[PDB]
């Protein structure tokens, strides 16, 4: 199905991030984020039978954890948190993360929690498991400069590579 192909792609993208920690317990995440600056985050497999993935993020009070729901081909933040209409849905889980990082980068949301009960997620920098390839680091840099990769003065082989991962994080 096209649903299955979109989920396979989402997991491929996840393997390119360099900040997907796979099998990692909630306590191992807690230890890994303990000394990190506020907003440092990672993604890992959830321990919960009903969820694939969980975000672990440093807050000023310590690391906390937020599950990601997948339902009918769409990812969104765990809906026990807020009404689902306020939790944007994405075909791609890296896209989901990129959206929330960019909201903070653009200072549309900050570290202070909102006062009307809308979603509070302060993300700054990912915690890498390992240094990514230089090619991927260039890719991130180009993505932060433009979305119009098919006009770049690059060979088509390298545009294909940029097209595989258009995120800024």
């Amino acid at each position: 199905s096209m649903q299955a192909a979109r989920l396979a792609k989402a997991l491929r993208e996840l393997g390119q991030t360099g900040w997907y920690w796979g099998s990692m317990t909630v306590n191992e995440a807690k230890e890994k984020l303990k000394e990190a600056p506020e907003g440092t985050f990672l993604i890992r497999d959830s321990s919960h039978s009903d969820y694939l993935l969980t975000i672990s993020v440093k807050t000023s009070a310590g690391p906390t954890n937020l599950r990601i729901e997948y339902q009918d081909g769409k990812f969104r933040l765990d809906s026990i948190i807020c009404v689902k209409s306020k939790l944007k849905q994405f075909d791609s889980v890296v896209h989901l993360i990129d959206y929330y990082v960019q909201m903070c980068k653009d200072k549309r949301t900050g570290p202070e929690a909102p006062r009307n009960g809308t979603v509070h997620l302060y993300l700054t920098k990912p915690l890498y498991t390992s240094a990514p390839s230089l090619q991927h680091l260039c890719r991130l840099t180009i993505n932060k400069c433009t979305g119009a990769i098919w006009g770049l003065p690059l060979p088509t082989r390298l545009k294909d590579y940029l097209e595989e991962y258009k995120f800024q994080v």
Partner: protein
């Protein structure tokens, strides 16, 4: 043998630890052909110097025992650096 010399298109000579240069799949195939010297006739020094910093950073930060910091890349070099990185397989 401990170090290797990488030469840019504009004549700059970069001396780097051999283990570090082996970060590049392309350099690795050349040494592990030819001397302990590789000439890059199409990579200029403002790019090759950055590639060498990436070698240092990749070797240092394979483990995550230390928080991995950001590797800075000026937008003005990113297109050439992407091509060099692709050529070098790193």
């Amino acid at each position: 043998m401990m170090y290797v010399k990488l030469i840019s298109s504009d004549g700059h000579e970069f001396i780097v630890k051999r283990e570090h240069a082996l970060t590049s799949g392309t350099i690795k195939a050349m040494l592990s052909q030819f001397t302990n010297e590789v000439n890059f006739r199409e990579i200029p020094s403002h790019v090759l110097s950055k590639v060498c910093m990436y070698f240092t950073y990749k070797v240092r930060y394979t483990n995550s025992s230390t928080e991995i910091p950001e590797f800075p890349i000026a937008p003005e070099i990113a297109l050439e650096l992407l091509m060099a990185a692709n050529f070098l397989d790193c």
